[PDB]
Amino acid sequence: NCVANILNINEAVIATGCVPAGGELRIFVGSSHSYLIKATSSCGLSLTNQVFINGESVQSGGRC
Structure with missing residues (x-):
């Protein structure tokens, strides 16, 4: 499995x-x-036909 993490403008979890x-x-x-x-076959995180805001970014926390 994969982990999903969200960061703010300061790239802080x-x-x-x-x-x-x-x-x-x-x-x-x-x-x-x-x-x-969304987690891709390569554990690639991404949004679902949606955009971020305030600099909201996504990072792979690792394995679940």
Whole structure:
């Protein structure tokens, strides 16, 4: 499996979550917000037809 992490403008881990193999999971980031993270065959994290904001970035926390 793969891990999904969300960072803020300062590239600081603000959200965390787990993502299955070849799947996707929505993580909670902010007082009231969330972002969907899709895991590719190569554990590549990416958004689902959606864009980021405030510099929100995604990082692979590693293995679940």
